[PDB]
Amino acid sequence: EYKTKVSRNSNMSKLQAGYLFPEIARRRSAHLLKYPDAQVISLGIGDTTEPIPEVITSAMAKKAHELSTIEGYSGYGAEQGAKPLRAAIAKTFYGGLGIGDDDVFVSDGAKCDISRLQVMFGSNVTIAVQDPSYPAYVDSSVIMGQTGQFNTDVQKYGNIEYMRCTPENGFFPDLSTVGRTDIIFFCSPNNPTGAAATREQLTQLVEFAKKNGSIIVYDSAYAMYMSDDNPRSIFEIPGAEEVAMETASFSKYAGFTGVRLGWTVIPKKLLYSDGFPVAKDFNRIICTCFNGASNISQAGALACLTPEGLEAMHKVIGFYKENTNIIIDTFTSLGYDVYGGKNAPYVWVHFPNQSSWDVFAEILEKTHVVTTPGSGFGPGGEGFVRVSAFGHRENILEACRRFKQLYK
């Protein structure tokens, strides 16, 4: 058979397996082959399940209709996003934090921004991540060439600072033990642990990044699930604007997982070591490597940031928060050390003395419930299982009775 003479990207070769979530989907498929008549309930991938509020979808349908009129048609937008949408995001989420409209970059969601930001930083930066954390930070790092080889002994790529977040440290890194890196990806409330950093901790994090001369990439995907009195934006920490940017999404707020709309904020005062503004390189990436978020998605996001839209999102979030309570109560009633599930739609359940992957297989096997194994979120996740709360109420309740029977 014919082969080209092009060498495979050696960074792609470094990757230890496929992406976590397709891997889980494979395993659930194999389970449906074994049990063809099983009633599978997925609490694995954190995908929203409830309909998008009408006020928002009417806004999208109206934009679609308008595209068939001479007056309403629009083509290429500003790749940063429509100005009224940047303004609404700037006012609504960062009002009083000194963020301008021109600091907001509208995207087709946060996973894409994470990789666009990794392209921008390039192959010579080193990164630190929460351990455990959402696997896209590590995987994108490997793909960009920022890392060594995977070491199977410790279960870690070389050259990544894994910042262990444990029950014994309150799921916040011990910063006095953390090596300096260029970038620090920091997710709060955290996926998978559910842990939301306090004001004092985030203060420490800014002080840490300021002294090490690092950039924090603050992932606030779950901030509007906040219950405790904790900061929802890193820019609430004075001095954050010199060391941090923030990336977020409408996915978990308006059910936009399929619709695709997020943003990144890069403050004017965030500068590389030569004084060059980081935002200006992001802007170049965004103009060259992207052609803007869908116009219909942007019209849906615009409608989200209005009194009716905010009320609708609060209702949605509230509903998933009530699912989370149900799951928490179940596991606590069962005598588990269960974490998170207060400030986030994830509960982080401790299964000590078992490997995550084995617990995943066991639950899937006995209860036809998909979970996500903790060690898919890095080596600090070993021994835990993340349980997602996105589901119809009846599905959540049924999964919980199934757990009660397995584990009684």
Place this chain on the structure above:
Amino acid sequence: EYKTKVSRNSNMSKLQAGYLFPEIARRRSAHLLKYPDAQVISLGIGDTTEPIPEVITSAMAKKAHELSTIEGYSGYGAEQGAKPLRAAIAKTFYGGLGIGDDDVFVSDGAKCDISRLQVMFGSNVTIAVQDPSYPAYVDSSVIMGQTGQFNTDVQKYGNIEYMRCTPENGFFPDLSTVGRTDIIFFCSPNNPTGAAATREQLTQLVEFAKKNGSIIVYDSAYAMYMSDDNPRSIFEIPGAEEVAMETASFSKYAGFTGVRLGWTVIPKKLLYSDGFPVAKDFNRIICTCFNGASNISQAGALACLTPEGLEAMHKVIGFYKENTNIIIDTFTSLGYDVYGGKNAPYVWVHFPNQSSWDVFAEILEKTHVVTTPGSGFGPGGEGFVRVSAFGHRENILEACRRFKQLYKHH
């Protein structure tokens, strides 16, 4: 003032200037500053201007509505795209060329795929491009670390094979003078020249790639504007499936420039030197770095690939083609050497003894018409201006009468 200790990405420093189209938009902004009441006609950026056909927007509006019901709501999709849409694209554009549903990757547009493909190839490959060509191939290449610095004497980035496409060579390079690279980006019908490679030239292109062990990234963004009897897909060339992938989009077919939907096709027989299939690395990129095209944009694309959609897309394309004729006739009456416009919605006009940027500025200042300087598409574009045919009819007519008024007495 405070600065971090993070070193700016050296590949970002390499970029000689801002991306082409924002730089034009800046100049048009400054123009409207100077003359706030100028009726600017924009033929710079190639943006669709006519309404999306009702059949396509009704489908999108329906998906939006369905998203508010328990039954019709959907969240994350298969990252490659909805299986029915992948099938429709495979059958509709590649039916009979051996392309499977699973070789199609639905994206939010071709610009985005180009850059995801470049992340996939990585920093250690060398590329070739047509010269002139759509500036995203070269810019994404610089950004990814594939290049040396910009050399202002020759107006080229180091380590890129710039393949000369001229009126004299029929806008197809002499491949005997083209050095071996890993990757060859090839656009046909080409942006900016409008030139469509014949079956004979594409066969040569494929034979060249096969003997060199190169991968062709074939960009078919304008293939449905074909008038001549030329291949619309690289996979029409036997053996293309061992050396070639293809990228395209609905932007120019249904006016989806703002909606955002295209696709890349990578065939199963495309392998790296170690035997690894290139599509398996792309799939990983697509799973890690992307979360799918918008579900509403997918519903719109699915509606385009029906008898009613194809009929609507064909009609809109033909409209822009008549615009292109008006523009061609205008410049040829004024005695310019003018290329393209046959197989593409672009007219490539030569201005002897003038820089492209000076011509751009001159047209913009005197007629309030925006164009794109040919040097924006690389050094072979120097001396040319690209005139986009996208616009309302009356605006193309007005632009053309402005050109004639300016240039008739010279």
